[PDB]
Design an enzyme around this catalytic site. Structure first.
Site, PDB file in Angstrom:
ATOM      1  N   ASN A 151       0.813  -1.211   0.000  1.00  0.00           N
ATOM      2  CA  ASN A 151       0.000   0.000   0.000  1.00  0.00           C
ATOM      3  C   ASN A 151       0.850   1.267   0.000  1.00  0.00           C
ATOM      4  OD1 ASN A 151       0.763  -0.627   2.679  1.00  0.00           O
ATOM      5  ND2 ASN A 151      -1.010   0.432   3.551  1.00  0.00           N
ATOM      6  N   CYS A 284      -3.306   0.658   7.090  1.00  0.00           N
ATOM      7  CA  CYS A 284      -3.419  -0.194   8.271  1.00  0.00           C
ATOM      8  C   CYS A 284      -4.015   0.551   9.456  1.00  0.00           C
ATOM      9  CB  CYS A 284      -2.050  -0.757   8.649  1.00  0.00           C
ATOM     10  SG  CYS A 284      -1.335  -1.790   7.361  1.00  0.00           S
TER      11      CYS A 284
END
Lengths: 488, 487
Positions: A151, A284
């Site tokens: 990511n 996250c």
């Protein structure tokens, strides 16, 4: 499109000996961006031996010599920010409005931070008695390994390699198979800045292969992994069983955002939006459980709808685009499965809930920004990390209750509270079981601030002074100047 | 002694496992006690107890916690001799050791951490006029310690002291070989005012109680002391179950480097203390003794002369300085290593057999054993023996001895003997070990962090850093400016 990407070992590109390749795709078009070579066992052995020789040269320099080389790497990253951001956008599907402002900016911020701290890495001295004292050395671990996530590919590569290198180590870095491209460019930049050959090697590969070979290798002293909660358990267990490696884990979360009943709801909605839909929800630390007082919930839902109308999907290189496709089509399939579970379990769909279709969307893995409300603590979308653009809104009644419900999870990465009240802000935050806590904000991760998870969300920390220290190992040395006494 | 129960929530309580085990007096073979083993539900009971106790403990002020741990120190000093006698009965270590080291240095570490509690501080970092960060060093919550049998109460104190001082509750499992003194420690903590549940002690078997501790979903950290192989399994299971934080203090094959300008009487004294204390059952022992070729013959004579001074006998006699090993299975293992040394060509200098005769036939005694003419690929040079077996290795030059010292997967301790300033520091700086002694061996002050490189450990014990590593960092950003959203 691009040439077949080789491994980066010992200051330049070298062909893998595995005979294996994989493809990385552009998540917005489905086009193959590059064929990439995958490091096999012998390739990992080559990289470790290269890292061993290079680490010795690197550690023998003075602290300021190391500092200047890393600072030169910072300079090159600033100059190449826009070029690297474009590459990251191609590889990840994240809008250039993000990658040009955050990914390399904040990755280099951490490298710049650690470059200046190298001369301040000190041991201790302890007097025992007139005839004996102890001193400690903060020695390099030697060769360490970083395993990155998809990511924030180059940001993670920088956040792991910067303290590892600043502490005197060599790092072998394995980027995610989904996003291998910018980590190779970083290795070029480090070499151009004067990093000794072998001190930063990059081994693209698959996790089931290259990642495992690194966690098993007998001569790697530490593994630092960023990724899913379940994957982190396997990586840590493999790192222990092979050779008892030191470990850092930065894993996922289901972080709560607590809106107090004295919060300004425009502010609360802004924070909830940034905590859920940045990088298309692929973060996250996202605040994906949003707790709102029952008496404010209806107005809060309206304010979320009003801001969801300001989400702009489109050309990822356009200035006003602020929302991208997900990184991959299998990931979208998983996110859609979670959304269907929310519908099936009785959550109220406030908006979104489907893939984006039509002109400019049919070739990318787009999911509409999705908000569920009337959620409950047992729902799958509330209990499990989704890693897409899915906000869950939960009514609550009182402060003690919301603290209990915020903490009633195996995750423990981040948390936040929105309140203008001095006492509420600190006393609520002090009770939350998370390593990263925001008051009246979300998402900012200064280089100075250690970040990592409680409970299942992590082991150890990244950033801050403490992470420079945790890439060293302590040696205690006793100097005995009195006459040693044996009892035999 | 009566059947020993579990210690949970400030008192003794019967296990529900249906299982008991016996601990043996290694000097006589007699059963000292039948001990209850904690089962799965018992571990659950202990964690729930610890959770409630930890909240009360952490809500006290720093100095309230300090005073309670200091009162426990006072009781340990008062009961030093009684606890030492029990430790001698359970371990086989001479009372001349247990009365001078085990509780003294265990309580030294508790006393150290008791004073440090008020100094445990977070940080504050200004970002800009409108925003700043502060950190809290918060308790992990409930942690578990798993002890080894060679220093039972010392290890219990070294793990529980920083854990309690950092605001945690600890569930401690002693070795099944030596369960008895950890239960006494739990009584002492309670008598000092430790809240119920903050220190619970669960005797049991490693494959049961220890496994359950490593698997439990609500235990935040495992600290294990034991063998290298066992540590890998404990860490892997701690990771797989719930991603617990871990500390591992494991074994070693530590090198002692004698420089060619060392006084050989000093070198031999250090070698003796690095090999035969606690009958060689010490993780940090300097069991590879490197001696220059030109000094090797005289050094061997000086070792022989001191080995002859070793006094095996009544473990409670003042002059006894050598005991049986902890168990008859452990003796069998040590003897197997000694036989490999003979088989593989090492020259037996002394010992090499069990002791027999008056006062020895009922205990697990092994003679103090020294091999010389050793080479790097011999099994006795490669592997930790955990018995009284010294391996003497000739070397030719400094660069060589540093390579050979470091050519091992172990990395716990090391030492050098030299009066030369440059030699002492320059050699020690090149050794791959966490615990390094110059012109000495064995001293482990409370202030000094100790632990292993490579396969010998994860993390550290003792020192300021171990108080800190029993907390977890929470970072808090206060944003006083107006938050900006791009949506």
């Amino acid at each position: 499109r691009m040439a077949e990407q080789q491994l980066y070992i010992n200051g330049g590109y070298t062909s893998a000996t595995s005979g294996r390749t994989f493809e990385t795709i552009n998540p917005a078009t489905g086009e193959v961006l590059a064929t990439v070579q995958a490091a096999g066992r012998e390739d990992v052995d080559r990289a470790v031996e290269s890292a061993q020789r290079g680490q010795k040269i690197w550690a023998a320099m003075t602290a300021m010599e190391r500092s200047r080389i890393l600072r030169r790497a910072v300079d090159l990253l600033r100059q190449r920010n826009d070029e690297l951001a474009r590459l990251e956008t191609l590889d990840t599907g994240k809008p250039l409005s993000e990658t040009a402002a955050v990914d390399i900016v904040t990755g280099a911020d951490v490298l710049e931070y650690y470059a200046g701290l190298i001369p301040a890495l000190e041991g201790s001295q302890i007097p025992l008695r007139d005839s004996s004292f102890v001193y400690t050395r903060r020695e390099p671990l030697g060769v360490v390994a970083g395993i990155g996530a998809w990511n924030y590919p180059i940001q993670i590569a920088l956040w792991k390699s910067a303290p590892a290198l600043a502490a005197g180590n060599a790092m072998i870095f394995k980027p995610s198979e989904v996003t291998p491209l910018t980590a190779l460019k970083l290795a070029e930049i480090y070499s151009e800045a004067g990093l000794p050959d072998g001190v930063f090697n990059v081994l693209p590969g698959i996790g089931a292969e290259t990642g495992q070979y690194l966690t098993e290798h007998p001569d790697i002293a530490k593994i630092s992994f960023t990724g899913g909660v379940a994957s982190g358990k396997k990586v840590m267990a493999n790192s222990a069983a092979s050779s008892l490696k030191e470990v850092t884990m930065e894993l996922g979360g289901k972080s709560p955002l607590i809106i107090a009943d004295d919060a300004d709801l425009d502010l609360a909605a802004d924070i909830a939006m940034m905590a859920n839909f940045y990088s298309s929800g692929q973060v996250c630390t996202n605040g994906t459980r949003v707790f709102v007082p029952a008496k404010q919930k209806a107005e809060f839902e309206h304010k979320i709808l009003e801001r969801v109308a300001r989400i702009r999907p489109g050309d990822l290189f356009a200035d006003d685009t602020n929302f991208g496709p997900l990184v991959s089509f299998p990931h979208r399939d998983n996110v859609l499965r979670y959304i269907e579970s929310g519908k099936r379990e009785g959550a109220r769909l406030l908006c979104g809930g489907e893939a984006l279709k039509g002109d400019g969307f049919d070739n990318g893995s787009w999911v509409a920004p999705t908000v569920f409300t009337d959620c409950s603590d047992e729902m799958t979308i509330v209990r499990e990390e989704i890693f897409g653009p899915v906000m869950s809104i939960l009514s609550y009644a009182d402060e003690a209750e919301v603290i209990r419900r915020a903490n009633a999870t195996e995750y423990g990465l981040a948390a936040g509270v929105v309140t203008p009240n001095l006492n509420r802000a600190h006393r609520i935050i002090h009770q939350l079981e998370a390593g990263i806590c925001w008051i009246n904000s979300w998402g900012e991760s200064p280089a100075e601030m250690p970040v990592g998870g409680y409970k299942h969300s992590g082991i150890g920390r990244e950033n801050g002074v403490m992470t420079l220290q945790s890439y060293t190992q302590v040696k205690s040395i006793q100097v005995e100047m009195g006459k040693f006494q044996s009892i035999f």
